[PDB]
Design a protein around this nucleic acid. Structure first.
Lengths: 102, 90, 323, 97, 80, 93, 110, 96, 83
DNA sequence: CAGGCACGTGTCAGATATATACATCCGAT
DNA sequence: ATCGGATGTATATATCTGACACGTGCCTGGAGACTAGGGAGTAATCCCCTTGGCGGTTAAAACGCGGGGGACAGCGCGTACGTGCGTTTAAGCGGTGCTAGAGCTGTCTACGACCAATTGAGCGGCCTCGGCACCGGGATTCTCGAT
DNA sequence: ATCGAGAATCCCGGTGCCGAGGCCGCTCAATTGGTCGTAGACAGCTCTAGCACCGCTTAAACGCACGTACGCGCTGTCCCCCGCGTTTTAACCGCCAAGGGGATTACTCCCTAGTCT
């Protein structure tokens, strides 16, 4: 398949099918699904790296949505990319204002 | 029955072989990837419409990724995508 | 035994290829007809054909309907359909095919007479195919094809004694008849890593001795045309025959001869033997398969016996390459 | 007896509620509120359980963000105790009114 | 169904505000937060019920709720 | 060039509503941009809402739903009433 | 071949149903477009434009002017309580802002 | 020696700049700033005048909104002078 | 060719004062001018980046107003009027 | 049309939490 | 001092996975020469639209300085809001028992997608006269100093 | 709680000016019949998961009593920005060169679904 041909793990066939049926433009070029697959693979790899690094803390070998929210909020740029989205049962990162503390 | 479960699991195994992912976080990743793909595709579509070009190509998605993502993520993503497409070309 | 079933599968394959734009249904039907024609028993039911690998559900039901009734309702309906039958008939002309068949039938051109009356709507290849419609559909007796080999070899060595020309195919396999002429030509000065005219002199001198009379297409490496044996001037002239000449580099000439000698089942059997033994063989070269599957550089080939030796397989004469 | 300084157990409780990821709202009263506010728009409509859970999660996120922002405003006002003036100003400055 | 608004209780608001990161709460916070929660909930429910009505079905779906949420900028993850 | 706009149209609407008022060119371009913006917004919402429900077309039902979604209370109510009267008069031919 | 009448006149509208149909077609919003969709959308645009210009005309009339300029339009849009909510995320070129002073900003007098 | 009380001339110019609708910023310094910010990214750019007008008055709108919210924040703190700490409040709680 | 520099100071103190008066303030603290200039510079940079990327698309060397109003529409401004 | 097969879907030992008893440091008075 | 509470370790629940087999729609068909055409890239203008100087011209920015009003501390009550302890009340949990409608599948048929002719409504030039931007005087209104 | 003396701020016409709006010629894209193709409408069938009810249990909510600590309120200082002359200066205002690039138009190359080997 083309995913092996492009050295990628996200399905180029499925994303090409979505571009066909999502009705974004009348015809879609050849490299468009490949390039989307690469971009999505990079973003997912970054998210999972941050989540795994967070799960290394707290001695948790399994990814939890709390870990995912922590990893997203700790990063600077990923915080702004996902600013207006809420993760279900994700909670918030710990933060107490200095004036409140004695 | 659309899902990205096996692919994100393969990516996680490639990056962190020893770490498992729960079902709820699995669904969160599914929603996140769908959100990003929809956002990029919509941006590319409207960008193609403004320029009066009738087809979406690698260049238009490259530009859409350049707008949507912040700086260093944008440059990393465009480098990786260009590498992937030039690998697929040969 | 099973001639009717095979004939019906052939007709269905022809309709699928020419009328349906379905090359894969045509291939499946032809494969079923081939495997049925080799079955040494009179078929008693479609399920009997279904137990063996090959024939699927649809073909089994069609065979069962034939055994019950002696025909297929769909086949009978499509036989009397003027448009579909006209398309199928027009696709028999060399050069006039599916696209041309639909276009011609849509504009009223359904028979050979309309094709002759509409010469300006046919290209050179279609016109020549129309001119030799009867001749092209005839088979070539082995003696006439031996004579054409003789003429071709004398002309080729007349062009240059360093040329090497081989007539491949069912003839090289020793069959008593073939449907066309296949010549493979090479010259030591022409390799994969080395003239744009080497075909041209042979073609031109074959024109000069009036052996080949028509040109269907001609390039630097591939020529397809129409040739005819010279008449005695007192006996009936020989029918026109199809001839193809392929120019192949010397390092790929013997691989090409092995490919174009066949037979096809023999080709896949040898290819599977090479694959299961760690080699990949194509029409052009022979390459190794690594432990990770990566194909290597082509190995030097100087004979068919060489290719047989690399795959540790005893050299089999083309007479013994039936499968 | 041994009592705590006001704010101390408040800080312990703020830590224990900020680390964990519960729902913090009783499910049945929220579901009854959703059903009672939904009947104004359409009479006798059914509700999937996951829809109620999603509504609760969204309300939790919205309210917790609003409370963080209005606490920030109150601390800005040289003040530590939150009053409704703060909430309505946090709503107005964010464009919601 | 009558005063479900009072269903959410004052300690529940207190715990939620604690998760928000606040130390002291006035007395009037509870009424204001009940009001703002009611207005936010009806704003979401209006769009969700509109989606449900367009689908010719008489039950809402969590998918409709996340769609109505995404419509007004409050994107939600973890439900599809 | 062949640039298109909503000049003739908005002028006719104004003369229908206010018989003794004119539009400055900048304000006219502002009205043009407003019309294009609302058209794009409504059509995009209708397109998305058609795509969810697995339908393959845009009709009066989902445009009515879209103008119930984006438009708030009174404005939405009156716009829906006007649109449905207009479409009934059209299909009555 | 009868005398052709435009579909906007058939529906009794001012905005063109034909142009809206064309924009829906080559705007790539859906594969197919129904018949009632453009006329409904044209009627909606008629109502919205009528509301805007009625308010702008009133704002010009009580400002002793007989021609709408962007200032009048922005005053009309931002003055209404719910028409503002439709256009709360938009800025208007050469629009200006409404005159409002908070109570504490005024002098204490006395 | 007739001097107005402080603050009164402030309110009456408030009336003036809330009643009129000009640009409030000179064209040339804004154009030079825009060209500087543009050449920071990439060189050899030319701007249409409508483009720099669009940037100018969009910037006016943004700064007007920011000062409105900053005034709200200042009045909240029982104070009539806006200091930068009010600006970081407005930027932070607006979500940017 | 004439590389521009030091133009952020070109936005004069009276200009910020006038914008503040339009906003509705009574008095201005002395050190908000630098913060306002910084706030403005970051906003112009955010808009100009998108406009320049749009102009890089279609291989065009001039920045028009229509692409920059598209860039403003990207960031939730949706400018009317121009274009 | 026929195969080949990659996702989708049940189903169970076991890593992976998870709640429950002491010791220790801290924390406020 | 001094009396009590959040983290480290054992330790028996518990529990939610990941690899392992079926099932069933995707999915590529398998090797390549042509082959006559469609979108897309490329060269050649036209002019217009932006940029760069060029000198007057003055509105606006820069600057200085008195001083008055507000930002900022500081102190003092005091009442509103934390803790703490009964108690009681309604939430979770775990069953049952219906049954309304979510979702799926099989026919058709009535809408829409193309498609030639046709024309009339909308788009560019092109004037032309009037709504409105200035523009000084003449009354009006607003504001601050005395008393 | 007044008057009085000055600074802003609307009403008087005039002055003219440039653009809003009819008007005409042109042209190309709505409009009108006609064909096909298929997307939903509509029915009927499962079956599941959502509503309703009951009891048991217990943890959180509610009410009451105190203690006290932030919130306002009131003074007191001083300093920092505002109002208002003076003194530059850089933004306008045309007034042109000038040339670079953004639209148009003719010419030639990836691709492309087969067409056959």
């Amino acid at each position: 398949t083309r995913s092996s041909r492009a050295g990628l793990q996200f399905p180029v066939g499925r994303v090409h099918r979505l571009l066909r049926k999502g009705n974004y433009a009348e015809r879609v070029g050849a490299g468009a699904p490949v390039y989307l697959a690469a971009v999505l693979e990079y973003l997912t790899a970054e998210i999972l790296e941050l989540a795994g690094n967070a799960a290394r803390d707290n001695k948790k070998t399994r990814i939890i949505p709390r870990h995912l929210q922590l990893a997203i909020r700790n990063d600077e740029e990923l915080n702004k990319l996902l600013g207006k989205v809420t993760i279900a049962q994700g909670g918030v990162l710990p933060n107490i204002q200095a004036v409140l503390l004695p | 029955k659309e899902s990205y479960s096996v692919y994100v699991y393969k990516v996680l195994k490639q990056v962190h072989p020893d770490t498992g992912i729960s079902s709820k976080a699995m669904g969160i990743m599914n929603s996140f990837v769908n959100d990003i793909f929809e956002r990029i595709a919509g941006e590319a579509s409207r960008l193609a419409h403004y320029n009066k070009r009738s087809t979406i190509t690698s260049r238009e998605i490259q530009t859409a990724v350049r707008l949507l993502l912040p700086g260093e993520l944008a440059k990393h993503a465009v480098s990786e995508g260009t590498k992937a497409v030039t690998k697929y070309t040969s | 035994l099973n001639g009717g079933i095979t004939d019906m599968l052939t007709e269905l394959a022809n309709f699928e290829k020419n009328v349906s734009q379905a090359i894969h249904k045509y291939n499946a039907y032809r494969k079923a007809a081939s495997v049925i024609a080799k079955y040494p028993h009179k078929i008693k039911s479609g399920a009997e054909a279904k137990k063996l690998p090959g024939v699927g559900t649809k073909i089994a039901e069609k065979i069962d309907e034939f055994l019950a009734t002696g025909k297929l309702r769909k086949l009978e309906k499509i036989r009397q359909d003027d448009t579909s039958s006209s398309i199928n008939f027009l696709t028999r002309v060399s050069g006039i095919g599916p696209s041309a068949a639909r276009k011609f039938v849509d504009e009223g051109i359904k028979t050979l007479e309309d094709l002759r009356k509409n010469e300006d709507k046919l290209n050179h290849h279609q016109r020549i195919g129309l001119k030799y419609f009867g001749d092209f559909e005839k088979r070539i007796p082995r003696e006439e094809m031996l004579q054409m080999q003789d003429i071709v070899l004398n002309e080729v060595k007349k062009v240059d004694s360093e040329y090497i020309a081989t007539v491949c195919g069912s003839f090289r396999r020793g069959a008593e008849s073939s449907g066309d002429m296949d010549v493979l030509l090479t010259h030591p000065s022409f390799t994969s890593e080395s003239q744009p005219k080497l075909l041209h002199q042979v073609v031109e001198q074959l024109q000069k001795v009036h052996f080949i009379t028509d040109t269907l297409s001609k390039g630097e490496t591939k020529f397809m045309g129409v040739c005819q044996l010279p008449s005695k001037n007192d006996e009936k002239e020989y029918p026109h025959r199809r001839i193809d000449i392929r120019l192949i580099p010397k390092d790929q000439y013997y691989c090409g001869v092995l490919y174009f000698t066949g037979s096809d089942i023999f080709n896949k059997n040898m290819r599977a033997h090479a694959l299961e033994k760690g080699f990949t063989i194509n029409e052009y070269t022979i390459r190794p398969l690594g432990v990770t599957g990566v194909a290597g550089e082509p190995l030097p080939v100087d004979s068919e016996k060489d290719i047989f030796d690399y795959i540790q397989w005893k050299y089999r004469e083309p007479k013994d390459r039936s499968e | 007896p041994h009592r705590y300084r006001p704010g101390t157990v408040a800080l312990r409780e703020i830590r224990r509620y900020q680390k964990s990821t519960e729902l913090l709202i009783r499910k049945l009263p929220f579901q009854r509120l959703v059903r009672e506010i939904a009947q104004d728009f359409k009479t006798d409509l059914r509700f999937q359980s996951s829809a109620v859970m999603a509504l609760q999660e969204a309300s939790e996120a919205y309210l917790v963000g609003l409370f963080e922002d209005t606490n920030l405003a109150a601390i800005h006002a040289k003040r530590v105790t939150i009053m409704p003036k703060d909430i309505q100003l946090a709503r107005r400055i964010r464009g919601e009114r | 169904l009558r005063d479900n608004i009072q269903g959410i209780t004052k300690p529940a608001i207190r715990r939620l505000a604690r998760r928000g990161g606040v130390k002291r709460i006035s007395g009037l916070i509870y009424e204001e937060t009940r009001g703002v929660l009611k207005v936010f909930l009806e704003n979401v429910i209006r769009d969700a019920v509109t989606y449900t009505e367009h689908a010719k079905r008489k039950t809402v779906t969590a998918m409709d709720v996340v769609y109505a949420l995404k419509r007004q900028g409050r994107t939600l993850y973890g439900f599809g």
